[PDB]
Amino acid sequence: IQLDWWKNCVLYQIYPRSFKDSDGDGIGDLKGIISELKHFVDAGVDAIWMSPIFESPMVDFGYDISNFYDIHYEYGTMEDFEELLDKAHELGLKVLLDFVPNHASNESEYFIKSEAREPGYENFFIWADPLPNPENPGVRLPPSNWVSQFGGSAWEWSEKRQQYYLHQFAIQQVDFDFRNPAVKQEMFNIMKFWLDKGADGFRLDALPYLIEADPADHEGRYPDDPLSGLTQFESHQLGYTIPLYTKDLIELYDVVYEWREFLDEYNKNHGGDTRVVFSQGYANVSMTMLYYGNEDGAIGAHFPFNFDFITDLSSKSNARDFVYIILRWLTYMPYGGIPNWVFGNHDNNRMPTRFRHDMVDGLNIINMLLPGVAVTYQGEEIGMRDGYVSWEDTVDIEACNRGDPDTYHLYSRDPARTPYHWDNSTSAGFSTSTNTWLPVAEDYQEINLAKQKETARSHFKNYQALTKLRKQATLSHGEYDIRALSDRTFYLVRSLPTHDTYVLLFNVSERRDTVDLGRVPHLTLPATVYVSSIHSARLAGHEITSSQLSLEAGEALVLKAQPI
């Protein structure tokens, strides 16, 4: 039976500001994306989601939204967006928008009206009174010790309103009150507006932070978060507190289930292709699985993002660690759940930087060959590395607020946001201008899409071979078997009776490894190399005939073998 599109799509995250500049201002834009929609068809991408493109002061490059109903002028107009949707659908692509429900810009009308106590907006954000200060009574203390994800107090004093407002993110990102039925209605209004425009669904931002302790349950006070007791964190630094009262509250999931109830209604009433929500939240695996639904029968996000290849694996990982981490989502996911696999995003170091340059193909093979949904971040299809960004060039508010000239590199997301490497032209073909909002990585001459399209073997040609492979019943409907053959090498087998068997072998280590292919289930020899790492001695079409296989450091093969 053929699956609904979202159950095995290749999903590509576009960071619009760094994708394509169509107008020589050094800033990626919608006309730029429209100009390269054909790239997604060439790559074998099914669906694109864009990081935020709504009206925003750009304090957090779009995650601070001042109007949820119109396009950010630097990216273009409502008309450009409508054209992007039209041409993407024409090419067969699905298009998801980055919805940011936790917070609004302090330049939003919601906030201005709330700060001024305009009726029906007074309780739109979290507003609280100061505490008195025993050590210097002149210096007001905030309602609680809560710490912002971007450093300092999560509480900002409003001169105008004579109260503190909550900001789990930047001072300029103001936390909506999700116990307010008017806030919750406004979220339906925003989603209805963009679905009415033709959007294929939403990526839902920062959900762990939706709800904080109600002061009603704590004698009218905001309860302090427990202390970590780690001496490397001072009271203004993220890590000083354990976010017991400020993150992963059980009530956040009820909001998500209400969103899915609304979306299921909409899909029923409008028909056509299913519109989906994919949720973003870094949390422990059990809190992450409540985004899918709960055991009482609630249904949530079509899936929450799996960040395990970001959070729990790196160049420090061995083959047993790879297998053990891959098994986590597969062990914890509810029955009928769609697995997904994320290798990078705009908040984390790029895939080849976190792992090694020689592991790029193996990592893209894992993404494409595991059951479910492959997620690609902008650049991973060509093996883009972290770009060098000086203190002087750093614009990430997280790095500016938490960091300084000596430390900024511990915090900055900018190195994973440097402009896309189209070719070896000025600014790697991202712009006609040499003034890119972030500096272009120094290695764009070695690493760009044009070069990879015209070399016999490249990351991009491997990417294309893998997205093409996902059309095979073996990958859409086959079983999986995964195990380590040593500390250095593991296998992943997809099998399905009467259909071809596909086997990943991946030496994730820095050393040669010789493995016994007789230990691999469902693998009969001779077998044919379908894809090999760009540094493999073995080419596509090569026959593997010996049961003893030496893999070089980082080497990955996909073998096509006889059906079970």
Ligand X SMILES: OC[C@H]1O[C@@](CO)(O[C@H]2O[C@H](CO)[C@@H](O)[C@H](O)[C@H]2O)[C@@H](O)[C@@H]1O
Binding-site residue ranges for Ca(2+):
102, 175, 209-210, 212
- Give which of a second copy, ligand X, Mg ion, none residue 63 binds (C-beta under 5 to 8 Å, depending on kind): ligand X
DSSP string, 316-368: T--HHHHHHHHHHHHHHSPTTPPPEEE---TTS--HHHHS-GGGHHHHHHHHH
The CA distance from 101 to 110, in Å, is 13
When the beta carbons of 21 and 414 are compared against Mg ion, the nearer one is 21
Q: Tokens standing for 483?
A: 């195990």
475 CB-contact burial (10 Å; exposed 0-12 / middle 13-18 / buried 19+): buried
Q: Give min distance, CB of 67 to ligand X, in A.
A: 16
Contact residues toward ligand X (CB under 6 A) are 60, 63, 100, 149, 169, 205-206, 280, 282, 346-347, 398
Does the footprint of Ca ion cover residue 175 (CB under 5 A)? yes
Contact residues toward Mg ion (CB under 5 A) are 21, 23, 25, 27, 29
Q: By CB under 5 A, how many residues form the interface with Ca ion?
A: 4
- Give which of Ca ion, a second copy, ligand X, none residue 276 binds (C-beta under 5 to 8 Å, depending on kind): none
Does the footprint of Ca ion cover residue 245 (CB under 5 A)? no
**Going residue by residue from 193 to 212, which x/- string records binding to Ca ion, judged by CB under 5 A?**
----------------xx--
Q: For 119, what's the count of Cα atoms within 13 Å in the CB-facing half-sphere?
A: 0
Dihedral in degrees, nearest 10, Cα atoms 295, 298, 301, 302 = 80
Contact residues toward a second copy (CB under 8 A) are 227, 229-232, 285-286, 289, 295, 318, 320-321, 323-324, 327-328, 331-332, 334-335, 483-488, 511, 519
When the beta carbons of 205 and 555 are compared against ligand X, the nearer one is 205
- Give which of ligand X, a second copy, Mg ion, none residue 1 binds (C-beta under 5 to 8 Å, depending on kind): none
Q: 339 to each of 88, 335, 417, 442, 469, how far by Cα in Å? A: 25, 11, 26, 36, 18
Q: Give min distance, CB of 149 to ligand X, in A.
A: 5
The CA distance from 141 to 157, in Å, is 10
Residue nearest to ligand X (CB): 63
386 CB-contact burial (10 Å; exposed 0-12 / middle 13-18 / buried 19+): buried
Give the distance from CA 189 to its chain's centroid.
Answer: 25
Q: Give min distance, CB of 351 to a second copy, in A.
A: 23
Yes or no: say if 362 and 322 are a contact pair by the CB < 8 Å rule.
no
- Give which of Ca ion, a second copy, ligand X, none residue 318 binds (C-beta under 5 to 8 Å, depending on kind): a second copy
- Give which of a second copy, Mg ion, ligand X, none residue 280 binds (C-beta under 5 to 8 Å, depending on kind): ligand X
Interface residues toward Ca ion, by CB under 5 A:
102, 175, 209-210
